Design a protein around this ligand. Structure first.
Ligand SMILES: NC(=O)c1ccc[n+]([C@@H]2O[C@H](COP(=O)([O-])OP(=O)(O)OC[C@H]3O[C@@H](n4cnc5c(N)ncnc54)[C@H](OP(=O)(O)O)[C@@H]3O)[C@@H](O)[C@H]2O)c1
Ligand SMILES: Nc1nc(=O)c2nc(CNc3ccc(C(=O)N[C@@H](CCC(=O)O)C(=O)O)cc3)cnc2[nH]1
Ligand SMILES: [Mn+2]
Ligand SMILES: [Mn+2]
Ligand SMILES: [Mn+2]
Length: 159
């Protein structure tokens, strides 16, 4: 099974200048819980944005060019990325925009955080078709001293 996980600001913005400008510790904790002990697939730009391997997960990087770090696994196509995960119950696709576009048609589940924040971005989550997806979990949180925007955790499953 393939799942996508992402955090979206207003208008599906996910990034600006190869960074995420907000800071929501509760959402990063949600990301860790939902990805630990699973393989994670990311594009090369997102690898550079994170800047180090994510511990406790098999890190698989898509790039058309040879890899430059043997602490992670490098692959050259979507099918190779999936194969490199092996026989696991759930593969997590962790972006960025280009990678999400390619894996969305193959995904059964979306883990989306909707953040009540406006930021001028250059990368968006794919326009997906709402009719194709059932919301099976949603949990809203007001802003607090650690998290400066309100946010909603949602899990959707392909109908
Ligand atoms: N808010 C969130 O949830 C979230 C999550 C992830 C990322 N982000 C943000 O998203 C932005 C990065 O997204 P992005 O769309 O620019 O880049 P991306 O999807 O992370 O990386 C694109 C790169 O991946 C490689 N690639 C993708 N598909 C491939 C394929 N089929 N075969 C081979 N290589 C492939 C290519 O690398 P080569 O050029 O080396 O061939 C391509 O240039 C950053 O701002 C980041 O902070 C946000
Ligand atoms: N919901 C969601 N939020 C995100 O921030 C997110 N980020 C990415 C890509 N970028 C990043 C950037 C940093 C870390 C990171 O530092 N993660 C640590 C945090 C642990 C914690 O804060 O408790 C990790 O071990 O996962 C992960 C992904 C992909 N999907 C996402 N999905
Ligand atoms: Mn092929
Ligand atoms: Mn197999
Ligand atoms: Mn806000």
């Amino acid at each position: 099974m393939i799942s996508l996980i992402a955090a979206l600001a207003v208008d599906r913005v996910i990034g600006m200048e190869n960074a995420m400008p907000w800071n929501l510790p509760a959402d990063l904790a949600w990301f860790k819980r939902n990805t630990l002990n699973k393989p994670v697939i990311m594009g090369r730009h997102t690898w550079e944005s994170i800047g180090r391997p994510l511990p406790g997960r098999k890190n698989i990087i898509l790039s058309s060019q040879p890899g430059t770090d043997d602490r992670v696994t490098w692959v050259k196509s979507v099918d190779e990325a999936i194969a490199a995960c092996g026989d696991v119950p759930e593969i997590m696709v962790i972006g960025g925009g280009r990678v999400y576009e390619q894996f969305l048609p193959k995904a059964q589940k979306l883990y989306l955080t909707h953040i009540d924040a406006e930021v001028e971005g250059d990368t968006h989550f794919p326009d997906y078709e709402p009719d194709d997806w059932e919301s099976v979990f949603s949990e809203f949180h007001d802003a607090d001293a650690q998290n400066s925007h309100s946010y909603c955790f949602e899990i959707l499953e392909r109908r």
